[PDB]
């Protein structure tokens, strides 16, 4: 759990930060901004490492593969670039979206990319060539974010139509349409397997014949609430309230015991779902907080912001 003393306040961007993530292996952190610069910092020492230009307009999302050797980024110029992170070079570029791309993610299999755009559809690309292979359609408005599950056999996409659709990769069929939010869904996040059983304890959800509790999912919206759904049944297991503005990012603690989230209320909130024990609040930034990320192993948290400053907090 991160606490109020931030470790470093890394500021270099000339435009608001959009997404911040951790390299899965190396002790290096990456932040994307609206100035088309993927600046790469070092969170351990609080030192700038090197920027990554190449996009024409604002970068909306960035993601690493399982091995961390590749970094896929999507920008507002309808382009998805791929980066050889060992060489810091753009080895490929992909076009095809009618309007700006606002999400990107690599399949855990490492052989495909998925992206979501304002053209009300989700595209899937192949790593070897860059050619679109599948096109998920069915959203009626801007799709904000797409994030696959752990094994890569399903994806989940939230959109401005105030719905969250869970899709099957194998046959493009819409497995679920979770619609209970009262506003635009801003962000989603899957539930790590380590938390599965704990989930069943918090909501009291009953197990099925196969013994698998059913994959769970989180959805933050501009209705200032974070809902949690069970994909296997398509029902809202619980709702979490307390944010004073639009939720921008939401994620699970690696230990499956807390839910971290950041909103436009300038606060990072750590919530408890099993016992509703902790509701910790952090005055993270002086302006809107756009995204957050929690390191898988090291006890650090990073949060972007509109004040054009990234912050690193230590977990204690």
């Amino acid at each position: 759990i991160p606490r109020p003393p931030e470790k470093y306040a890394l500021s270099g961007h000339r435009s608001p930060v959009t997404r911040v993530i951790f390299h899965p292996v190396f002790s290096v952190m990456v932040s994307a901004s609206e100035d088309a610069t993927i600046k790469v910092w070092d969170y351990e020492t609080g030192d700038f490492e090197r920027t990554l230009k190449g996009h024409t307009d604002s970068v909306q999302d960035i993601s690493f593969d399982h091995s961390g050797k590749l970094l896929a980024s999507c920008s507002a110029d309808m382009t998805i670039k791929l980066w050889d992170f060992q060489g810091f070079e753009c080895i490929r570029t992909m076009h095809g979206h009618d309007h700006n791309v606002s999400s990107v993610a690599i399949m855990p299999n490492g052989d495909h990319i998925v992206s979501a755009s304002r053209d009300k559809t989700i595209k899937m690309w192949e790593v070897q060539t860059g050619y679109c292979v599948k096109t998920f359609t069915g959203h009626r408005e801007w799709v904000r974010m797409v994030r696959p599950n752990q094994d890569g056999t399903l994806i989940a996409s939230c959109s401005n139509d105030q719905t969250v659709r869970v899709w099957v990769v194998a046959t493009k069929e819409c497995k679920a349409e979770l619609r209970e939010h009262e506003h635009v869904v801003e962000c989603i996040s899957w539930a790590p397997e380590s938390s599965y059983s704990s989930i069943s304890e918090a909501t009291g959800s009953e197990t099925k014949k196969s013994g698998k509790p059913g994959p769970f999912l989180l959805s933050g919206s501009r209705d200032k609430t974070i809902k949690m759904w069970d994909v296997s049944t398509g029902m809202c297991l619980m709702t979490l309230v307390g944010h004073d503005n639009w939720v921008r990012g939401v994620l699970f603690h690696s230990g499956g015991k807390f839910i971290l989230s950041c909103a436009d209320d300038k606060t990072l909130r750590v919530w408890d779902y099993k016992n509703k024990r902790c509701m910790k609040t952090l005055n993270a930034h002086e302006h809107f907080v756009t995204s957050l990320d929690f390191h898988k192993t090291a006890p650090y948290v990073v949060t972007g912001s509109v004040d054009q400053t990234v912050k690193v907090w230590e977990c204690r």
Binding site: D57, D77, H183, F288
Partner: protein, 1001 residues
């Protein structure tokens, strides 16, 4: 006796289905029960909000076999409404031994609640069609259907009407031959004690949430009643038609206070008083039109609060910006003005990327209005009616707040062909989206988007009932029934019957469809609009945006001119200053005087319009968009003029430094020489005026503020007026600026300052009359923010524009032409200029492109025409024109385009007459005149060329006079200009005087 002092639950206070049993209520309910059990049609006549509908429903719910169907009467209703109502609910048209009409639900009667029955207009000779129909189908117990001319007899059908006193404006009395069959009951406004007890029960039910303000239940109520009574005896309907205050206002008052107290846990008396005052301001301070009434309302709200709570902290409860929001926090709570401003600025920055990249200034008024509209959108059935001058931001603010609330804004695309069927299809679309496939919708209507009265009556029934009957007929009914069934299964409700699904759909539409009617504050149109559709004045909360106050105009002026270098440390404050801004600091700096003069100019346009209206013809309305264009022109002109003057001074200084270096050279050689001294003397002949200009550079920089202000005000406002009015406006502006000691270079014509001679030559060669007014109009055509509209009796401006943009492949098109769309689309995708004629038949599909409703797509700007969305090219420019000086344009187009009036002047007509008479009478002299005028223009063009090239070459050289090219260039330039001066002087002496003498006769 039979009036129990019931205690309402702490929840559902002031709910639609609750009423405190009072003497009048139990008496009138008993009377209505007596009359309804006898199945006798009846009528309730009372002022709006007295409690006629609630008493009727209370009487009806006692009868368990009695089901009601609502009906709203406008002033443009026909018996076809009743026929549709019977076809929809009374399907059985069976004819056993006679045609009889009965509802499906057997054993149950039907009450057709007709509201505002006396609105239906009486045609000539004094007859109301629907009233006559009711008299026929009541007295004779049936009617004649038009399908077979057969008599249909009513079964299990009865009528109750709700109306108003005849002396109420907009009301008309019923015929005595009709009043025979319907008894009348008069329901008056609840009396002071009655209101006290009725709402006292509500307040004691509400304050039970916080078990510390219980003791404040009995004062609060009284205070409300006190204040309410004042609003009835001060803002009568005799002043404006919408000044009707009923117990309904006190009901929504208690509901608002209760909702503001629901999630909150603990609250002192100060917070309760603050919430009460905020609600009273949201219920009694918005519909007001003028500021005097607003000041009176604020004074008396604070006065009554202090009177009814002597031991209160006035400052904590009564602050000036009484604001509340649920954006900053998750609970409806007070918010400070500055934090709200910062938050709305950031959210508006996000909104720009979302939609409408058009920037907005955030002054105090905007914040208030966006809070009000958010309040209304948060309500379940929230219908809003914004009355303000066009362009004030009503539509854009509504779209902004709707985006904030997740509503999918849907506006009708009105066009020339738009008819009743098109609007019915639009209503089908919006209702299908709202009811089935549930999604909130901000249906935005404009007072011009309504063409037929059918649109008004459809909107009336949709607003009041929450659902328009008969819109989905035949196949549409079945398809909607299927869609509602699927939506119910998705939601979880299992419904099969038709009426169950219809009621579910109606509830969904009521919950998830908010209508925003934007209308212009037209006098004598308020009463007419109330008569033609009472729902707007009954089921819609009225927000009077009005026109931007001087305070608001001052804020937007400062905010946009926050980049201009208006600071003048030596600005001497005059002994007298004309104060226009109410809160102007009396020792103001230069910026606070410039913005003051800007708002003064905008206020001057209103006086000019009034003067033209009093003695003259049509006047075009002044809107805040004109002020925005004035400020944008002022800023752009300031940057351009400052940049040009600075660059000129830089070139002059570097040239003079090079001349000093040349002087050093020639002097150190003197201490190959004759040419040096000759060029020194010839160049000093110009160095004298160069040094004069360099010295006066500071003076020109000093007076760049007033001159740019006057020029922007001229090219942004006086684009419609004739020469006399333009000169009077400019003279008044100059007099005011001189009063404020604002520096501006006098004795300089506006046309010369705005436009140089270089483009004036092209204009004159492009078939443009050589006069002041035409030059100014061309200037306005050149520098424009909103696309122009040319109002010319003669066609001269048409070929002027055609030749000027001929090189760009400008295309000729008209609104009347059917291919107008295609050509338009072509331009929108190719960026070629477009000139559109016949603007009288304006096509509203142009509304987005005129407002630049572009959408950045990572480098491409995208515009939606009608329903199809097309990429825009940056080279696209569109012009509008007509040949009718005396013609009226639609109000929506008045504020969307700049106006340029190509009138004729006495000077221009004299010039044309002289030129033609010299062409005919003395052709030889006219030929001389023409060849000398063109020759003089060519000399001026060459003079500017050689003079500028001299400076350019002098700047470019970085060496010294030893360069071989520089000496020959400077000698040839001096020779050439001296020779050109020789021709100029000789032709202006010996040949121009003779031409003038010949033309003098």
């Amino acid at each position: 006796a039979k009036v129990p002092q019931i205690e309402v639950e702490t929840h559902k206070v002031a709910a639609p289905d609750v009423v405190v049993p009072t003497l009048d209520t139990v008496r009138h309910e008993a009377l209505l029960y007596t009359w309804l059990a006898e199945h006798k049609p009846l009528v309730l006549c009372g002022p709006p909000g007295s409690g006629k509908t609630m008493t009727l429903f209370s009487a009806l719910r006692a009868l368990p076999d009695m089901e009601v169907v609502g009906l709203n009467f406008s002033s443009a209703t026909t018996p076809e409404l009743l026929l549709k109502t019977f076809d929809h609910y009374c399907e059985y048209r069976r004819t056993p031994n006679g045609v009889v009409l009965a509802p499906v639900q057997l054993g149950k009667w039907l009450v057709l609640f007709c509201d505002e029955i006396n609105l239906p207009d009486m045609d000539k000779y004094g007859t109301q069609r629907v009233i006559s129909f009711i008299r026929q189908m009541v007295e004779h117990g049936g009617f004649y259907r038009t399908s077979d001319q057969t008599w249909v007899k009513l079964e299990r059908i009865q009528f109750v009407g709700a109306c108003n006193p005849p002396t109420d404006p907009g009301r008309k009395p019923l015929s005595h031959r009709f009043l025979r069959h319907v008894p009348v009951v008069y329901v008056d406004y609840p009396g002071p004690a009655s209101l006290t007890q009725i709402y006292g029960t509500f307040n004691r039910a509400m304050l039970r949430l916080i078990p510390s303000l219980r003791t404040y239940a009995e004062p609060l109520t009284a205070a409300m009643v006190e204040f309410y009574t004042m609003s009835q005896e001060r803002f009568t309907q005799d002043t404006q038609p919408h000044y009707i205050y009923s117990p309904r206002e006190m009901t929504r008052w208690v509901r608002g206070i209760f909702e503001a107290l629901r999630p909150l846990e603990t609250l002192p008396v100060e917070g309760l008083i603050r919430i009460w005052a905020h609600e009273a301001l949201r219920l009694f301070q918005d519909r007001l039109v003028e500021d005097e009434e607003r000041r009176w309302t604020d004074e008396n709200i604070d006065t009554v609060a202090l009177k009814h709570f002597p031991n209160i902290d006035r400052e904590k409860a009564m602050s000036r910006p009484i604001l509340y929001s649920n954006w900053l926090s998750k609970d409806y709570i007070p918010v400070d003005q500055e934090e709200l401003r910062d938050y709305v600025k950031a959210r508006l920055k996000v909104f720009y990327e979302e939609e409408l990249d058009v920037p907005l200034v955030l002054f105090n008024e905007v914040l208030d209005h966006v809070l009000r509209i958010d309040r209304i959108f948060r309500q379940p059935q929230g219908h809003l009616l914004l009355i303000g001058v066009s362009g004030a931001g009503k539509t854009t603010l509504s779209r902004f707040v709707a985006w904030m609330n997740g509503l999918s804004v849907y506006q009708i695309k009105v066009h020339r062909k738009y008819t009743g069927e098109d609007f019915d299809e639009d209503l089908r679309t919006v209702l299908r989206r709202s009811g089935c496939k549930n999604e909130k919708i901000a249906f935005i209507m404009d007072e011009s988007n309504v063409l037929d009265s059918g649109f008004l009556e459809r909107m009336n029934t949709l607003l009041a009932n929450g659902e328009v009957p008969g819109l989905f007929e035949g196949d549409e009914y079945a398809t909607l029934m299927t869609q509602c069934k699927e939506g119910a299964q998705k939601e979880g409700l299992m419904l099969d019957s038709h009426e169950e699904l219809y009621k579910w759909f109606t509830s969904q539409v009521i919950r998830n469809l908010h209508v925003v009617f934007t209308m212009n504050p037209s006098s004598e149109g308020l009463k007419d609009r109330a008569a033609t559709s009472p729902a707007l004045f009954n089921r819609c909360v009225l927000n009077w945006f009005g026109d931007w106050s001087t305070e608001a105009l001052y804020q937007v002026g400062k905010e946009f001119t926050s980049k201009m270098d208006l600071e003048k440390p030596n600005y001497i404050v005059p002994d007298y200053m004309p104060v226009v801004y109410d809160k102007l600091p009396q020792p103001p700096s230069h910026r606070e005087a410039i913005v003051n003069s800007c708002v003064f100019v905008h206020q001057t346009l209103h006086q000019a319009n009034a003067r033209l209206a009093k003695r003259g013809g049509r006047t075009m309305a002044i809107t805040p968009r004109h002020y925005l264009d004035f400020i944008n022109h002022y800023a752009n002109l300031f940057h351009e003029k400052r940049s040009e003057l600075e660059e000129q001074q830089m070139h002059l200084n570097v040239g003079l430094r090079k001349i000093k270096e040349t002087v050093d050279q020639v002097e150190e050689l003197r201490r190959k020489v004759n040419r040096s001294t000759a060029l020194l003397k010839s160049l000093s002949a110009e160095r004298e005026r160069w040094e004069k200009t360099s010295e006066t550079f500071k003076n020109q920089m000093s007076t760049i503020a007033g001159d740019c202000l006057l020029s922007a005000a001229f090219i942004a406002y006086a684009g419609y007026f004739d020469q006399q009015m333009r000169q009077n406006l400019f003279t008044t502006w100059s007099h005011h600026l001189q009063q404020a000691n604002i520096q501006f270079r006098t004795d300089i014509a506006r046309t010369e300052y705005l436009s140089n001679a270089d483009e004036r030559l092209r204009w004159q060669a492009s078939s443009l009359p050589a006069d002041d007014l035409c030059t100014e109009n061309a200037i306005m055509l050149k520098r424009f923010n909103r696309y122009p509209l040319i109002i010319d009796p003669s066609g001269q401006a048409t070929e002027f524009i055609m030749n000027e943009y001929k090189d760009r492949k400008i295309t000729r098109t008209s609104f009347l032409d059917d291919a107008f769309r295609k050509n338009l689309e072509s331009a929108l995708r190719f960026g070629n200029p477009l000139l559109v004629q016949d603007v009288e038949s304006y096509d509203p599909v142009l509304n987005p492109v005129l407002n630049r409703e572009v959408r950045r797509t990572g480098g491409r700007v995208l515009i939606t025409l009608g329903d199809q969305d097309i990429d825009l090219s940056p080279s696209f420019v569109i012009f509008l024109s007509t040949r009718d000086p005396t013609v009226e344009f639609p109000p929506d187009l008045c504020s969307r385009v700049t106006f340029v009036n190509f009138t004729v002047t006495r000077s221009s007509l004299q010039s044309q007459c002289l030129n033609e008479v010299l062409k005919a009478e003395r052709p030889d002299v006219d030929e001389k005149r023409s060849d000398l005028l063109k020759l003089q223009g060519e000399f001026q063009l060459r003079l500017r060329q050689l003079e500028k090239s001299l400076l350019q070459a002098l700047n470019e050289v970085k060496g010294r006079i030893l360069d071989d090219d520089t000496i020959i260039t400077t000698l040839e330039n001096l020779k050439r200009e001296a020779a050109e001066v020789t021709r100029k002087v000789e032709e202006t002496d010996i040949v121009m005087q003779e031409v003038e003498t010949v033309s003098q006769q």
